[PDB]
């Protein structure tokens, strides 16, 4: 206990040091990107040691040192709970960011604010680490909004980019929709449970977490790009390509999922809430993959796949596979990112182009990336003995070897087939075929940082699943006596989709005329969901705010219901008081009536 917890505290402060040096304006802005490299790589280097004793003895603890609020009965202090999930995620996160911004130094170098750029990834990193290394929801809330506003700024990296500003505007908007459930859980825990720290909430035995569980589910739904809260994740791709190989690549999107596994002690209690997760996760797997199947991009498709994947692990959370889900996330973080800058390496080399329909013939001309993308394409599908094998294949069996609704399984096989089909598609357009690219053959990847950044992710995307699986003891009862086929089905459902796509890729060569199929359009407007949600309800909500609301309620009625009416009433009859013609006969006549009615009539004398 002298190492480990102290080492984690050392790791999370050394990452802040670049920001402290940055704001101190004593740092040199030129080598600061390389200075950032050394910090993240070192911070990763000290991130390995906290694993060592967890492998050894498995010790876990909570660090709460400086007491912030006393708040009568509810004390507040900064607190990190280091458990299985948090401990081994830090090296996974640390290794990913070090490699992706290693690639980003070569890629993201033609911009004046690369110093300010790399600083932003740093400002993401401590916010994300604040989220994962948390012990009460408020600190996780700190990281939750920190990364969300971080995406807002990073997505809108080009402040002159109108589309990026809209994507950033949608990015936080959907993220704030998720926090509504976070606030709902926040209020319930402080009221019914009267606690904020993770430990007390779990062990208070809140066997009626129905409303909190919905609040937790809504929070993860917004953060993990569930259906209805999905389109921001594709929208985040509008920013710079490294930014797409960042927060929204596989880092920030899984924060809500990390919250889901965090609250697994109470998550399993309600089967209803347990169900709706794998439902929405299943729909994301079908829908987002379906959109990516007939599509004309690279980052968008693998972004849709990420949402399909993001729908995958919390389906397993819906079937009570928390630790297995977390293993899948780290494996997912490995190869999903791994193909991200490989796509970015293609984008940089092929003059910042994204559509597949201008790729081709790149197999021989893009050697190192070709191997990298080829492995990672079906590494997402996870052939035996791979990061994806110990996660995806076990996930498909686990939901099949459990008690779910009839359609829950079918979406999972549909997910595996549909994901693989376009996973083969993007290779076909990119490397195979013929170079549908401009005559100037600039295509090149000789940059050393390009190779080295991806190189460490080959060893990650292939080795990690094996080593981690034997390094982590099992959490649930193993599935031993099993009726054969529902395990082999996961492997096979991958290949006809590959086979169907293979001939589908061949049919592109076929000179047969093609018709505007309904499915082609349907998957290309993302199921027309952004076509109507970003159009109809927004227009109604914005429009009524002016015809009504601003004008009709406030500026037409409120000032007419009190100020103008009373002002007019005084205005109207102040005239009749003051419009006296001055006739003396009329004045004294009024005296006579007032004199007469003073008594007798009004009887003021009685």
């Amino acid at each position: 206990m002298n190492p480990f917890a102290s080492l984690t505290l050392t790791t999370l402060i050394i990452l802040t040091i670049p920001i402290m040096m940055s704001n101190s304006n004593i740092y040199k802005t030129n080598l600061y990107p390389n200075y950032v490299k050394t910090t993240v790589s070192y911070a990763f280097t000290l991130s390995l040691v906290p694993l060592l004793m967890f492998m050894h003895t498995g010790q876990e603890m909570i660090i709460s040192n400086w007491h912030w609020m006393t708040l009568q009965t509810v004390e507040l202090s900064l607190s990190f709970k280091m458990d299985y999930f948090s401990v081994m995620f830090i090296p996974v996160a640390l290794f990913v960011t070090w490699s992706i911004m290693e690639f980003s130094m070569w890629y993201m170098h033609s911009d004046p604010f690369i110093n300010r750029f790399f600083k932003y990834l740093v400002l993401f990193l401590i916010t994300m680490m604040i989220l994962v290394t948390a012990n009460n929801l408020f600190q996780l809330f700190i990281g939750w909004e920190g990364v969300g506003i971080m995406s807002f700024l990073l997505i809108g990296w080009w402040h002159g980019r109108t589309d990026a500003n809209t994507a950033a505007l949608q990015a936080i908007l959907y993220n704030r929709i998720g926090d509504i459930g976070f606030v709902l859980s926040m209020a319930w825990f402080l009221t019914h449970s009267n606690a904020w720290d993770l430990q007390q909430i779990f062990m208070l035995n809140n066997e009626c977490p129905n409303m909190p569980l919905i609040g937790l589910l809504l929070a993860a739904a917004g953060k993990s790009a569930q259906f209805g809260l999905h389109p921001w994740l594709p929208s985040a791709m509008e920013g710079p390509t490294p930014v797409s190989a960042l927060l929204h690549s596989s880092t920030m999107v899984v924060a809500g999922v990390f919250l889901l596994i965090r609250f697994y002690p109470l998550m399993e209690t309600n089967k209803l809430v347990q169900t709706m997760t794998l439902c929405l996760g299943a729909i994301t797997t079908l829908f987002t993959a379906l959109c990516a199947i007939t599509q004309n991009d690279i980052k968008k498709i693998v972004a849709f796949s990420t949402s399909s994947q993001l729908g995958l692990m919390m389906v397993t959370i819906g079937i009570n596979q928390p630790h297995l889900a977390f293993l899948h996330i780290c494996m997912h973080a490995f190869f999903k990112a791994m193909l991200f800058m490989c796509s970015g390496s293609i984008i940089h080399s092929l003059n910042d182009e994204q559509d597949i329909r201008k790729m081709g013939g790149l197999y021989k001309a893009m050697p190192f990336t070709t191997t990298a993308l080829i492995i990672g394409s079906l590494a997402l599908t996870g052939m035996p003995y791979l990061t994806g094998f110990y996660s995806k294949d076990l996930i498909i069996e686990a939901v099949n070897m459990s008690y779910t609704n009839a359609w829950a399984l079918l979406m999972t096989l549909i997910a595996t087939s549909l994901t693989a089909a376009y996973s083969t598609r993007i290779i076909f357009f990119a490397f195979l075929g013929k170079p549908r690219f401009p005559p100037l053959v600039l295509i090149n990847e000789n940059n050393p940082l390009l190779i080295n950044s991806i190189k460490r992710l080959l060893i990650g995307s292939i080795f990690a699943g094996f080593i981690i699986s034997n390094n982590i003891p099992p959490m649930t009862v193993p599935n031993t006596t099993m009726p054969l086929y529902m395990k082999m089905t996961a492997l096979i459902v991958t290949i006809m989709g590959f086979m169907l796509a293979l001939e589908l890729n061949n049919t592109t060569y076929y000179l047969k005329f093609k018709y505007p199929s309904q499915t082609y359009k349907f998957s290309n407007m993302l199921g027309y969901y952004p076509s109507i949600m970003h159009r109809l309800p927004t227009y109604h909500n914005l429009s009524m705010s002016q015809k009504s609301a601003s004008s009709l309620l406030d500026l037409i009625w409120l000032e007419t219901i009190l100020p103008k009416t009373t002002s007019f009433i005084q205005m109207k009859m102040s005239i009749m008081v003051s419009n006296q013609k001055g006739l003396i006969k009329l004045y004294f006549l009024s005296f006579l009536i007032t004199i007469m009615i003073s008594m007798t009539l009004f009887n003021y004398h009685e």
Binding site: T404, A406, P483, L542, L552
Partner: protein, 156 residues
């Protein structure tokens, strides 16, 4: 530089004052068309086409290409939600009714097939995991004082 005649006037009724607001608002006589006189207070402001800034042609030399507007020309009363970042009125290749029908169908069906799947809960043909020690009576949180109701199972 500013005066009432070029200020926005009341609701225009006579055709001469329709022309009067036309030169003030910088269109032609036939291009002036105020909002309906339902009492909403729009008055002399013309009902410009219900379009968005996304519909505007990028190639035209806009004086404000950041939002595709030009100096001097009249602008829309509801320009604010009809600019590039906000809601857009540009045409879509699919018919709006058809794509809305597609959405209102799919999301309705999606719930439907899962709903019947909930009515058909799939499971493996296996027995229950009867846990030892009264399915972990004390361990799960049973009362230490009173004895459990022994959930003790023989072997098959």
């Amino acid at each position: 530089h500013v005066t009432k005649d070029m200020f926005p006037g009341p609701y225009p009724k006579t055709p001469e004052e329709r022309a009067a607001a036309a030169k003030k608002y910088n269109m032609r006589v036939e291009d002036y068309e105020p909002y309906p006189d339902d009492g909403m207070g729009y008055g002399d402001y013309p009902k410009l086409p219900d379009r968005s800034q996304q519909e505007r042609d990028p190639w035209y030399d806009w004086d404000h290409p950041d939002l595709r507007l030009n100096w001097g020309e009249p602008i829309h009363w509801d320009l604010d939600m009809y600019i590039r970042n906000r809601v857009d009125t540009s045409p879509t290749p699919v018919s709006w009714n058809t794509m809305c029908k597609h959405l209102s169908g799919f999301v309705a069906f999606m719930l439907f097939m899962f709903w019947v799947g909930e009515i058909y809960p799939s499971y493996q043909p296996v027995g229950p995991k009867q846990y030892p020690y009264n399915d972990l009576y004390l361990e799960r949180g049973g009362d230490p004082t009173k004895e459990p109701e022994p959930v003790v199972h023989y072997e098959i």
